[PDB]
Design a binder for this molecule. Structure first.
Ligand code: MAN
Ligand code: MAN
Ligand code: MAN
Ligand code: CA
Ligand code: CA
Ligand code: CA
Ligand code: CA
Ligand code: CA
Ligand code: CA
Ligand code: CA
Ligand code: CA
Ligand code: CA
Ligand code: CA
Lengths: 152, 151, 152
């Protein structure tokens, strides 16, 4: 009772100090290659890779390629693209059904920010998606190399 | 009694978090960070002009490196030495020439000026850079220097 | 009692939040320069340095140069070497007694993965160890510059 109470007050002090230390370290971690938005975190590897290799890096790391599902998420991702000045690959593709872009899960897009005229499947072989420094999207060949950005 | 059990369970979970966190703090700081007291300095690894550098730090939830003691200055110096690139500090005398202040407007509580500095060379040096030897020199804000933020 | 009960529930909520937030943060931290194996974490600095310099960097960081003690640890370390496509230095040397490799403490090796014919003290001057992209080890001159990888 009395012992338990003070034991609770003591443990909470420890937990709140931990919350403070963690919050500080989270900010430190995100600088300068990450961006937090909502409960999602985007982080770039700082280099470019073809889609398949980029996808594998994110999955092996316990996440997946950047999948902006709102204007806010797209804006956060855009910050990293602008910072590295390198267009990045998104996770979505229309490899299964041409013209129908989906997330790795197979779910259809719930948000899109296609540049005017896109997606055009240029050359009849653009099944991956890249995001430019202006935040707009363009379908591009999966074999091209683009900035690797994962979401966790 | 049920609460007693819950408390003992929480103690074990907290001990685990503390141990795991302790390890990750060391991992995080390697190789671009420095912890001194309750402050953490971290470099972006590249150079930028003052305004750009300042914005990067502020948007990241911190501010440009602002050593307030010899200890903090020495810690910051370690990053500068490691990257072999002089860095910008947060302080400027842009408001009133000759009076350097922190982004808040507060006057300096510590400084490590090289002899003869600040000298407002060319009548246009309102920013501050820190050398690999830890000394400070006022320099043009337009120059590009290592970006180091504090959190 | 009743109050203590409400506070314990609040504390429980705080700890659960931290467990979830910390787990996410760990994945973010490790991407793309770290590898977790068991209770050990390997992290590369992303650049090369001669042995002495690399060794000092790790020690000052509160850790030490990569010291794989099992096939599992060696495989984890190998992932970073492959990722950076740069051979890395291990912590072990035979500087004290030629022909006898030891950890920084002085203890004899508990595991090794030498390439065929190694260690061979080529030129009578190889007292350090490098790990290749294939995971095998080779003794090499300590003055050479190799990928810096520390363990924490
Ligand atoms: O290089 C491919 C690229 O070429 C142009 O920029 C446009 O036609 C794009 O739609 C297309 O993706
Ligand atoms: O250090 C002497 C002098 O050298 C250059 O002119 C600049 O770096 C000045 O800021 C400095 O004051
Ligand atoms: O042929 C093997 C031999 O090649 C070179 O001489 C060096 O890399 C040596 O360390 C290695 O033992
Ligand atoms: Ca980190
Ligand atoms: Ca197609
Ligand atoms: Ca297509
Ligand atoms: Ca296109
Ligand atoms: Ca002035
Ligand atoms: Ca001035
Ligand atoms: Ca000057
Ligand atoms: Ca020898
Ligand atoms: Ca030898
Ligand atoms: Ca050899």
């Amino acid at each position: 009772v009395a012992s338990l109470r003070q034991q609770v007050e003591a443990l909470q002090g420890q937990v709140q100090h931990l919350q403070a230390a963690f919050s500080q370290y989270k900010k430190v971690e995100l600088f300068p290659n990450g961006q937090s938005v909502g409960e999602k975190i985007f982080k770039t590897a700082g280099f470019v890779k073809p889609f398949t290799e980029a996808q594998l890096l994110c999955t092996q790391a316990g996440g997946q390629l950047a999948s902006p599902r709102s204007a806010a998420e797209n804006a956060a991702l855009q910050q990293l693209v602008v910072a590295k000045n390198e267009a990045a690959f998104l996770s979505m593709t229309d490899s299964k059904t041409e013209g129908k872009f989906t997330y790795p899960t197979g779910e259809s897009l719930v948000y899109s920010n296609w540049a005017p005229g896109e997606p055009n499947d240029d050359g009849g072989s653009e099944d991956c998606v890249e995001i430019f420094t202006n935040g707009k999207w363009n379908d591009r060949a999966c074999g091209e190399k683009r900035l690797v950005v994962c979401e966790f």
